[PDB]
């Protein structure tokens, strides 16, 4: 575990993280995809061997000794708000189980279902609150990755509001 488990946020490419493992915002089919998923495919292509897994689950594949946790958030274009919310919570619970099993002291994590799977809605608070629900009982240092300056400020405020 980390000596004093923390949350932090950084505004940069999650493919250049400084943590002991990465969470991919994966598609169910293990395809290279776009956005975070395509950056993760370029950096760790070996981790897409048999990475296909259903919505609401996470599947870890090792790139050398570096774990890639493929977490499949729901596409809100296809899911109802209710079922989508349940699957988004479940994906993060499966991430916490994998981070625990791996025994890592740190993990790089994107906000699931906030990009092309958002169904055109702002889901920063929804996704971050499910991330906290899952990861609060873990002792890894969590580093959240985002690309927007306003999102960075809002995620940082949410972290500091609890401290
Ligand atoms: Cl960057
Ligand atoms: Cl997304
Ligand atoms: Cl972002």
UniProtKB/Swiss-Prot annotation:
Macro domain sequence ranges: 4-163
Localization of this protein: Host cytoplasmic vesicle membrane
Effect recorded for residue 13 to A: Partial loss of ADP-ribose 1'' phosphate phosphatase activity
Annotated phenotype, changing residue 36 to A: Partial loss of mono-ADP-ribosylhydrolase activity
Record PTM text: Phosphorylated by host on serines and threonines.
Membrane topology: Peripheral membrane protein
Residues reported in the UniProt entry to bind ADP-D-ribose: 13, 27, 35, 115-117
Role description: Seems to be essential for minus-strand RNAs and subgenomic 26S mRNAs synthesis. Displays mono-ADP-ribosylhydrolase activity. ADP-ribosylation is a post-translational modification that controls various processes of the host cell and the virus probably needs to revert it for optimal viral replication. Binds proteins of G3BP family and sequesters them into the viral RNA replication complexes thereby inhibiting the formation of host stress granules on viral mRNAs.
Notes concerning its domains: In the N-terminus, the macro domain displays a mono-ADP-ribosylhydrolase activity. The central part called, the alphavirus unique domain (AUD) has a zinc-binding function. The C-terminus region, also called hypervariable domain (HVD), is mainly disordered and binds several host proteins. This intrinsically disordered domain contains 2 SH3 domain-binding sites and 2 FGDF motifs necessary and sufficient for the formation of nsP3/G3BP complexes.
Subunit structure: Interacts with mRNA-capping enzyme nsP1. Interacts (via C-terminus) with host G3BP1; this interaction inhibits the formation of host stress granules on viral mRNAs and the nsp3-G3BP1 complexes bind viral RNAs and probably orchestrate the assembly of viral replication complexes. Interacts (via C-terminus) with host G3BP2; this interaction inhibits the formation of host stress granules on viral mRNAs and the nsp3-G3BP2 complexes bind viral RNAs and probably orchestrate the assembly of viral replication complexes. Interacts (via C-terminus) with host NAP1L1.
Record's protein name: Non-structural protein 3
Naturally occurring in which organism (per UniProt): Chikungunya virus (strain S27-African prototype)
Region of the whole protein represented: 1334 to 1493 of 2474
